[PDB]
Amino acid sequence: MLTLDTLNVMLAVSEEGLIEEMIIALLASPQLAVFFEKFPRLKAAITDDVPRWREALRSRLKDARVPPELTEEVMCYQQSQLLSTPQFIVQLPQILDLLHRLNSPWAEQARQLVDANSTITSALHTLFLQRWRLSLIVQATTLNQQLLEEEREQLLSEVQERMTLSGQLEPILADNNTAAGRLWDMSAGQL
DSSP states (O other), X not given: OOBTTXXXXXXXXXXXXXXXXXXXXXXXXXXXXXXXXXXXXXXXXXXXXHHHHHHHHHHHHHHSBOOHHHHHHHHHHHHHHHSOHHHHHHTHHHHHXXXXXXXXXXXXXXXXXXXXXXXXXXXXXXXHHHHHHHHHHHHHHXXXXXXXXXXXXXXXXXXXXXXXXXXXXXXXXXXXXXXXXXXXXXXXXXX
């Protein structure tokens, strides 16, 4: 079962910036939307709840699996390095047929790529994985955009639950993960 944490490995990206968009997604959701207007003081809690949504998605990448669409994006990618050079030539227009089947954007690019060079010895095979790798990062923007919409619903019941803190406060435990990074420098000279 293809798990969601694979995206962190195969793209080498961090979740934190995408989790920030997920904060905006929740602050836009109808539950929090009405809560902010109806409770102009109590909203300060759930607007401060930014590093809490972090731990929700940080667990969820390990727990949850990939979207049904994304499944074939990552599987065709990882299959191409298992697909050895003699087998890769004859099953070349077949993996291209798979891309065209789903209507994935890699269908058009990989088609032109193999029309550019059908004499795949080593160079194109390497470029096939790399060209899709970079293209899958900017595509994962949309794939994980659909994720943050679905997951929003689940943790929406979770955030309206914790909303008890603004009416009969009863607390729960949570991790504090501070990304500590700084290097000041001012090496300059002027006469």
